[PDB]
Amino acid sequence: RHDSGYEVHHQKLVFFAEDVGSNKGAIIGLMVGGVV
Amino acid sequence: RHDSGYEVHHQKLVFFAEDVGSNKGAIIGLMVGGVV
Amino acid sequence: RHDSGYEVHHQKLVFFAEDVGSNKGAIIGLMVGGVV
Amino acid sequence: RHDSGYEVHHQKLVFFAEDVGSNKGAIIGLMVGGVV
Amino acid sequence: RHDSGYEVHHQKLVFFAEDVGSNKGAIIGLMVGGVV
């Protein structure tokens, strides 16, 4: 038996980020995996 | 038996970040894995 | 038996960061694994 | 029996950071594993 | 029996940092394993 009240089994998140363009400026409060 | 009140079994996060462009400036409050 | 109140079994985080572009300046408050 | 109130079994974090570009300046408040 | 109030079993952190680019200046408040 498991008897869980709150449960989450599997969550898969895949992020692909590629940047070829140049001359770009940014201001980010909090950046996880994105490309600037 | 497990008897858990709150539980999370598996969570997979994959981040791919590539940067080829140049001449880019940024200001980041908190950066985890992203490319600048 | 396990009898846990709060529990987290497995969490996998994968970060890939590559930087080929040049001439880039940044200011980061807190950087974990990202490339500048 | 385990009888844990708060528990975390396994958490895996993988960070890959590569930098080929040049001429880049940064200011980091706190850097863990990222490349500048 | 274990009877733990707060517990953390295993946490694995892997950091890969490589730097090929040149001419880069940085100011770091606190650096753990990152490359400058």
Residue numbers in the entry:
A (entry chain E), B (entry chain D), C (entry chain C), D (entry chain B), E (entry chain A): 5 to 40
Task: Copy out sentences from the published article reporting this entry, exactly as the authors wrote them.
The major pathological hallmark of AD is the accumulation and deposition of amyloid-beta (Aβ) peptides (amyloid plaques) outside neurons, followed by the formation of intra-neuronal tangles of the protein Tau, the loss of synaptic function, neuronal death, and irreversible damage of the brain tissue. We investigated Aβ40 fibrils formed from this monomeric Aβ40 in the presence of negatively charged liposomes composed of 1,2-dimyristoyl-sn-glycero-3-phosphoglycerol (DMPG) by magic-angle sample spinning NMR spectroscopy and cryo-EM. Here we present the cryo-electron microscopy (cryo-EM) structures of six lipidic Aβ40 fibrils that assemble from three filament folds, providing structural insights into fibril–lipid interactions. Indeed, the three lipidic Aβ folds are identical in the central β-strand formed by residues Q15 to A21, with only minor differences in the sidechain rotamers, but they differ in the conformation of the N- and C-termini.
L2 and L3 fibrils each consist of a single protofilament and reveal two alternative lipid-induced protofilament folds. While all 40 amino acids were successfully modeled into the cryo-EM map of the L3 fibril, the N-terminal residues of the L2 fibril are not well resolved, suggesting a higher degree of flexibility in this region. The cross-sections again reveal lipid densities at the fibril surfaces in the neighborhood of hydrophobic residues. In particular, the C-terminus adopts a curled, shell-like conformation in both L2 and L3 fibrils, stabilized by interactions between D23 and K28, as well as by hydrophobic intra-subunit interactions. However, intra-protofilament interactions between Y10 and Q15 in the L3 fibril result in a compact conformation with two consecutive 90° bends of the protein backbone. The absence of this interaction results in a more extended conformation in the L2 fibril. Conversely, L2 and L3 structures consist of only one molecule per layer.
